């Protein structure tokens, strides 16, 4: 009886290899609400969406050593610290 789906006008995108979601919808900060409350509401929708995505699209492996998700390769490319060999 608690809704776990998240509907926004524009879809989230994801980089699950970095445990990451993007919410490209405008950050809604109505002046009449405290900043932290506004931020928290958007965070909750986004983390819901991210967790939904992790649990539904990543293989789940259970063993006697616990339960793990297999993550896809990270898609965000980041600069190196040191040159390639």
């Amino acid at each position: 009886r608690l809704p776990i789906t998240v509907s926004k006008p524009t879809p989230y995108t994801f980089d699950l290899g970095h445990l990451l979601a993007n919410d490209p919808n405008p950050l809604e900060l109505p002046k009449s609400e405290p900043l932290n409350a506004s931020l928290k509401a958007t965070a909750r929708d986004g983390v819901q969406s991210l967790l939904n995505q992790l649990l539904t699209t990543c293989p789940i492996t259970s063993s006697q050593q616990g339960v793990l998700l297999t993550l896809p390769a990270p898609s965000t490319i980041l600069p190196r610290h040191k040159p390639l060999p």
Binding site: P79, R80, L84
Partner: protein, 231 residues
């Protein structure tokens, strides 16, 4: 050669404002064990003047990022983030810490939360249109920096029990004549029975509440960035 976690130097001087020092301690905790916190007791560096000392300290500590806290009249409560590629600064950005509305201030702390284990990878959430704007050089840089900073040691597996907390980086919608504002907030993830297979998420606010105005930006030269981006 696959690099492990990008090591982070957290740096401040003796007259660093306490709230900024708290932020550095929390950042040091979040990036443990691939980070070093150093109290530079001699005098103050100024990376936008010269990056020599920043590079020297980063290399000495084998760090690929430096987070530096400083404050003066013109740039109060400044957090400077630099990346290092091939022993030289790559890109740099200043983040100017803004006052909270109530005027509470950041509580003293040494870690994000007693209920979040030190060293866990965060869930990350980038919210707001600006992150999806490929023409915003500032948000492009900051997203790259913040993922690079907090991704930890990436791996293709994660314990479901490790999915404990999140960082949201909220980009306030841009206004034509104003420097961008970004908001960092951390949350403990609370999962409860929903009636569905998937759990319902609720959040608890944890750690320092950070609001920043973007200050100076130092882009990497085009050719150098292209070199650093070779995978």
């Amino acid at each position: 050669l696959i690099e492990g976690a990008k090591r982070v130097l957290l740096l401040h001087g003796s007259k660093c404002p306490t709230p900024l020092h708290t932020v550095l301690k929390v950042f040091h905790s979040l990036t443990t064990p691939h980070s070093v916190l150093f109290h530079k007791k001699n005098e103050n560096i100024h990376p936008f003047e010269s990056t020599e000392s920043l590079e020297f300290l980063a290399n000495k500590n084998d760090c690929g990022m430096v987070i530096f806290g400083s404050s003066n009249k013109k740039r109060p409560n400044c957090l400077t983030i630099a990346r290092i590629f091939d022993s030289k600064v790559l890109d740099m950005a200043e983040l100017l810490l803004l006052p909270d509305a109530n005027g509470e201030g950041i509580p003293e702390m040494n870690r994000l939360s007693m209920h979040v284990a030190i060293g866990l990878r965060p869930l990350m959430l980038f919210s707001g249109s600006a992150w999806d704007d490929t023409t915003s050089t500032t948000h492009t840089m900051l997203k790259s920096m913040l993922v690079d900073l907090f991704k930890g040691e990436t791996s293709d597996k994660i314990d479901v029990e490790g999915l404990q907390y999140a960082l949201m980086v909220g980009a306030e919608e841009p206004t034509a004549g104003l420097a961008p504002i970004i908001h960092l907030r951390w949350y403990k993830i609370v999962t409860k029975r929903s009636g569905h297979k998937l759990p319902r998420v609720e959040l608890e606010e944890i750690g320092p509440k950070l609001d920043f105005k973007v200050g100076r930006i130092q882009e990497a030269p085009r050719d150098v960035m292209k070199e650093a981006m070779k995978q």
